[PDB]
Design a binder for this molecule. Structure first.
Ligand code: MG
Ligand code: MG
Ligand code: MG
Ligand code: MG
Ligand code: MG
Ligand code: MG
Ligand code: NA
Ligand code: NA
Ligand code: NA
Ligand code: NA
Ligand code: NA
Ligand code: NA
Ligand code: NA
Lengths: 1011, 409
């Protein structure tokens, strides 16, 4: 049989799911979570051979190794070793849609391993094998004899090998199918890979054993008392002498314990479960768990004879916390949460979908360091160690079933079909059986983008019956269906409704109050961080803080799914969809992270850190009011540092200890500040610093900051007189102005500044000209493709209107000699096919001090699409090492994404002024700049700018960052105005109207001088 | 004037435009639009190009699509505007035949002007003296005082056109919403008027920083800079250029800086007392009635012409009143101002309006006071006892630019 083309067979001979076991035979090792001699790892070197279809596998393989097999590391995804290509497809299935069938050409991975089993494991008890993750379906043989089969790439499949093994050497044979009927439920937006990609282990259990255990914690009204109830089930030899003892420890102290014989209460006319027992432990003033203080106890579950023989022990970390929705709010330990979440896929640029401890830890540290408190397992159960880590470091987790059928038409075609209820049920029920005792899991989710089918209703109900301690959520079918306790839309905007038929995305504020609605609203995905994005992020956070029932959301997403490829020279480079020959594919849509695949931050990360701060500030006079948003901890590792500077020049600063209770406020009155008579703007910056290191951060970590303008003393001082007047020289083709060692040349045919000399060195490689376009961001392109243009996307609107190809026509160019200056006046029109799109009028006034003041007034036709920017650009001849500016920084910042940036004097290496987004676009802008210094130049004004070795033309024409090449000189773009970047989603225009350049008339001015 | 804003926002028909398509949606719950027709009109900068009428037949809560005919191109630069109105042809128990119950406007195509003007028949002359810079062109003369830095006089022939010089203005005679419950006997320091007073806005005096004159090929250019100060702090800085050319037009560019720590000002504009009084006021902008930034939805962009007294709103408690926003051209007597500004024009100075508590005691001053604003603060009104002007309507940008052309007509 082709069990892989039959959704009615999702496994054969597989054991029941249960929470993590280790079968310790000494209780103190179980208490300490030390390694168990009864749980071995089979990870390491295995043998592997690739076949194009299961029909090509030779029978000999069951009995012996194939000489042409290779030795490879397991776990792994075989695409990462080059056997076949990974495929990046977003919604469309990677296979023909014809359920329950798959391609007859179906890559098959033949893995095998020869390993040892000690005789002792075989003299008694049971020896099982456990495969934590096999994608997507597999048959298993032990010593040439068939054992069983399994589906669901994201949960463990366990088989009893007791009768198949022998002392000494044994050989496993695992035939893994890339595609199976399970693939129709695994359509998540990520690379499509395959193989034995999670751990493989061997577990010895006694014949009479703990087969499952569930731990619950219930509380009194103020959380001063709890009852820990642990239900324990056994399999095997049931006898009167058996007992279970559950003990609870806080560190090395035992806080509670209970012992009882088996036999639960009567439950029906036939009696009760003679194979189960429930112990109830009372715990006074329990230390509660939360993401803020992840207090944990250890529960040890001993199966033993009453006279004292421990049969085996199992155990888990316990977090006393209650999760409940009451009066429309999701509460944790009675207080309303505010979810600073992120969706995180399991992705590594070298290892594919294989996870390792180091990487998980690195992600949890950076998450916490960036003020996230929650993570959604988009869109499947994770490697088991992830939960352990979130329980211990403290992150709230949404645990999600591995069910996504996005590519079906309509999307609920399978989920509303009772024939797919059995396969879906297993994905939901086995996840709950495995992860139900982890405190970090606070909400269960039914899967993702599978529409809303009656199977979801049935399953929502199943979980609510089996586990009343956690709410259940599910976004499909409109985000507020009967299968969800939380309104959990993806990409609904803050104020703007998107009334699609059947599944509208209402403004989140309006959604909460629709007639009859009362549920809390937490976005399962928002703020799509693809490329230069996160524009509008602050709008979400202001709403969340203002509306109680708006309880946050999970950003999409943590890490770009880029993969490393190697060029001819052997240098690594980041690849995306289609870079492996994969087609159809969805190109760069796999990169939507706050961080690059190697965990380096994208600039949007600091914007999320700032908006997600846990302390809010108000300034009144010289009184700073700090308010805490922590629900349970006092600010016992925080001090406030304050600094006042005049245009970047430090004036005074200090530190004050912070002592605010959770939800409390503290007023801090600052010292007498300076009042310099000297011109400039005083700015106050405050930062919250954690003096002591923690499990997740180093001493001195900064957790929050904010700035305010204080007094401003406008300059009224006149500049001294110049012992000099610039001279003008004219010809039919140019206007040349000279002043001391400086010269300016303006071309009369083009109407632009074509060259400038300092000393006798040329300063420009290309003339100074207006610029109205930008190399388009992923959000400007959305889903548009050359083969399928989306005319509504910004990039397409600009293209069609001719912005990228409009030519400047000179309307006027004159030069006049003033008292102490030369004035050049120009006007140009940009047209396209007869339409005047923009008119630029400027004056350049060069005075006896050598400065050149440029005034620009632009008109933009009201009927052309609002342009990306209104600015000037030029290629400077010089390449200098540093860039120094007085303005917002130090990282890249855009109009709709600049709250995190602070105004100060910044100074960075040139290369830091470029952001290496994998898919190149306009990048590196810094806004609110008052002075910019590069080499000998200085420009002053109130503008936004970018500066790098790459032209906007080059960035627009190159698809991958490693293909860019530094141009001669440095390209400077200095904008009077720049359009927002958007990001509420990356497939429809998302720049908010207030960030569009629609004013019609714009004015800006700059002074370019030397030094 | 606020009644018309209420009428417009409370309209029972909503409209959207998509291309040639106007979509009318009915907000009636029970009746069909059985006493209504849609009238439409397309005008270029006020000049009518085409219009028509279509009967409305929309069920309660329903929609009706109306296709406008082919839009012949216009023969001249300018912005085309579409206005639609819902007219009830028949009288009812509460209205007369012809009653307009709803309206809306949209901008349609705009063709920016790229046509170079035309070489001036003459070149203005600059006469410099110790105390003034004078410019003469034909029978017109302008005088800039060198110690004050303002245009203090302008003549048409031998007729003076100003009673007070043209000077920047950053304050307004306070509205009831600016005052709130503040009283001389019990100041509410949080009210806008008190914040402005306390900051010195009403007392600040212009200090000259610069006044120069240059001659260009076909024009004379006057450059000035002034600081407004109070108790040693600079509240505002205004930099301007006046360019007078062979055509007789005076182009004024204004760039202002407003200290960040001073309360946002009520307006950023210029003012003067014109010597003459004229019967009518004609403008191309929003109207016809008084409108302010946060209260201009009901006003329509067109060419309006009213008697000067209609340009003053007789609120019983006098204050700043009569502004019209979104104005591209204003005509009064022989004068014309072109740009993109807000203005009010009347026989009462802001000073008198703020000093007088009852309209019946106001008296027409000599000449006409003209206030032309590049920017004006919202008037608010969510309540009248606490500051109620929304952030988006406060003049908090820090630096502001506007430009106007004053010429003779
Ligand atoms: Mg199957
Ligand atoms: Mg014991
Ligand atoms: Mg034995
Ligand atoms: Mg999907
Ligand atoms: Mg801020
Ligand atoms: Mg309107
Ligand atoms: Na909230
Ligand atoms: Na594609
Ligand atoms: Na994606
Ligand atoms: Na502290
Ligand atoms: Na590109
Ligand atoms: Na009708
Ligand atoms: Na008054």
């Amino acid at each position: 049989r082709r069990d892989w083309e039959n959704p009615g067979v999702t496994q054969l001979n597989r054991l029941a799911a249960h929470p993590p076991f280790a079968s310790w035979r000494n209780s103190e090792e179980a208490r300490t979570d030390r390694p168990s001699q009864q749980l071995r790892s089979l990870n390491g070197e295995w043998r592997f051979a690739w076949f194009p279809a299961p029909e090509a596998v030779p029978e000999s393989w069951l009995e012996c190794d194939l000489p042409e097999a290779d030795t490879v590391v397991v776990p792994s995804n075989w695409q990462m070793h080059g056997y076949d290509a990974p495929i990046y497809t977003n919604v469309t299935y990677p296979i023909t849609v014809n359920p329950p069938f798959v391609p007859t050409e179906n890559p098959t991975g033949c893995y095998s391993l020869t390993f040892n089993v000690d005789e002792s494991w075989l003299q008694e008890g049971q020896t099982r094998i456990i495969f934590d993750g096999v994608n997507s379906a597999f048959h298993l043989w032990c010593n040439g004899r068939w054992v069983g089969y399994g589906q669901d790439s994201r949960l463990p499949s366990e088989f009893d090998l007791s009768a198949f093994l022998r002392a000494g050497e044994n050989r496993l044979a695992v035939m893994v199918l890339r595609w199976s009927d399970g693939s129709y439920l695994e359509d998540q937006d990520m690379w499509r890979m395959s193989g034995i990609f999670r751990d493989v282990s061997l577990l010895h259990k006694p014949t009479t054993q703990i087969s499952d255990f569930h731990v619950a914690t219930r509380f009194n009204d103020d959380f001063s008392r709890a009852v820990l109830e642990a239900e324990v089930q056994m399999c095997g030899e049931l006898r009167d002498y058996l007992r279970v003892t559950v003990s609870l420890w806080q560190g090395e102290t035992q806080v509670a314990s209970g012992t009882a014989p088996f036999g639960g209460e009567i439950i029906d006319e036939r009696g009760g479960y003679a194979d189960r027992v429930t112990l109830r432990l009372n715990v006074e003033n329990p230390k509660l768990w939360s993401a803020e203080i992840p207090n944990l106890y250890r529960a040890v579950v001993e199966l033993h004879t009453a006279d004292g023989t421990l049969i085996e022990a199992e155990a888990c970390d316990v977090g006393f916390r209650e999760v409940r929705i009451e009066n429309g709010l999701l509460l944790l330990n009675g207080k309303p949460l505010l979810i600073r979440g992120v969706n995180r896929h399991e992705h590594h640029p070298l290892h594919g979908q294989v996870m390792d401890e180091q990487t998980m830890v690195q992600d949890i540290l950076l998450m916490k360091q960036n003020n996230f408190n929650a993570v959604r397992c988009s869109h499947y159960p994770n490697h088991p160690l992830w939960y352990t880590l979130c329980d211990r470091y403290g992150l709230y987790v949404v645990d999600e079933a591995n069910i996504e059928t996005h590519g079906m038409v309509p999307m609920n075609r399978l989920t509303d079909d009772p024939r797919w209820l059995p396969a879906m049920s297993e994905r939901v029920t086995r996840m709950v059986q495995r992860d139900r005792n982890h405190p970090s899991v606070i909400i269960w989710s039914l899967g993702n983008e599978s529409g809303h089918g009656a199977n979801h209703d049935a399953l929502y109900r199943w979980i609510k019956s089996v586990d009343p301690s956690r709410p259940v959520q599910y976004e499909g079918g409109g985000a507020d269906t009967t299968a969800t306790d939380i309104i959990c839309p993806m990409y609904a905007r803050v104020d703007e409704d998107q009334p699609f038929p059947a599944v509208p995305k209402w403004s989140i504020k309006k959604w909460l109050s629709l007639p009859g609605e009362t549920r809390p609203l937490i976005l399962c995905e928002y703020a799509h961080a693809m490329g230069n994005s996160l524009g509008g992020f602050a709008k979400y956070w202001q709403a969340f803080r203002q509306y109680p029932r708006l309880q946050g959301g999970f950003v999409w997403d943590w890490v770009d799914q880029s993969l490393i490829k190697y060029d001819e020279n052997g240098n690594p480079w980041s690849a995306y969809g289609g870079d492996f020959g994969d087609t159809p594919n969805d190109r760069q849509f796999c990169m939507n992270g706050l961080v690059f695949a190697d965990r380096t931050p994208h600039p949007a990360l600091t914007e999320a850190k700032h908006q997600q701060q846990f302390f809010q500030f108000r300034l009144s006079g010289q009184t700073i009011e700090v308010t805490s948003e922590y629900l349970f901890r006092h600010s016992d590792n925080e001090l406030l540092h304050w600094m006042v500077a005049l245009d970047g020049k430090p004036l005074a600063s200090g530190e004050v200890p912070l002592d605010v209770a959770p939800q409390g406020k503290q007023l801090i009155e600052l010292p007498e500040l300076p009042q310099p008579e000297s011109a400039g703007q005083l700015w106050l910056t405050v930062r919250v610093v954690q003096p002591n290191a923690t499990a997740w951060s180093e001493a001195g970590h900064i957790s929050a900051w904010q700035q305010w303008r204080l007094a401003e003393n406008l300059s009224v001082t006149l500049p001294a007189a110049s012992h000099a007047i610039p001279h003008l020289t004219t010809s039919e083709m140019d206007f040349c102005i000279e002043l001391g060692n400086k010269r300016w040349q303006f071309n009369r045919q083009s109407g632009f500044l074509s060259q400038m000399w300092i000393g006798d060195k040329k300063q420009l490689l290309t003339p100074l000209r207006d610029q109205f376009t930008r190399a388009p961001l992923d959000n400007d392109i959305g889903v548009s493709e050359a083969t399928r243009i989306d005319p509504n996307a910004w990039v397409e609107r600009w293209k069609a209107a001719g912005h990228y190809q409009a030519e400047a026509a000179l309307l006027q160019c004159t030069a006049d000699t003033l008292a102490d200056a030369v004035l050049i006046t120009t006007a140009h029109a940009w047209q396209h096919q007869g339409k005047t799109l923009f008119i630029s009028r400027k004056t350049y006034r060069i005075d006896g001090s050598g400065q050149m003041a440029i005034t620009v007034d632009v008109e933009v036709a009201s009927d052309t699409p609002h342009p990306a920017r209104i600015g000037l650009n030029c290629q400077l001849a010089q390449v200098a090492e540093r860039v120094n500016w007085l303005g917002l920084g130090p990282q890249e910042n855009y109009p709709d994404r600049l709250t995190a940036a602070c105004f100060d004097r910044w100074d960075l290496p040139l290369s830091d002024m470029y952001t290496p987004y994998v898919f190149p676009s306009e990048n590196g802008l810094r806004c609110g700049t008052r002075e910019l210094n590069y080499g000998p130049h200085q420009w002053r004004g109130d503008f936004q700018f970018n500066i790098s070795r790459y032209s906007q033309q080059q960035l627009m024409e190159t698809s991958h960052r490693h293909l860019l090449h530094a141009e001669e000189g440095t390209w400077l773009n200095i904008d009077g105005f720049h359009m927002g970047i958007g990001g509420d989603d990356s497939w429809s225009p998302s720049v908010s109207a207030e960030f569009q350049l629609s004013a019609g008339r714009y004015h800006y001015q700059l002074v370019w001088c030397q030094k």
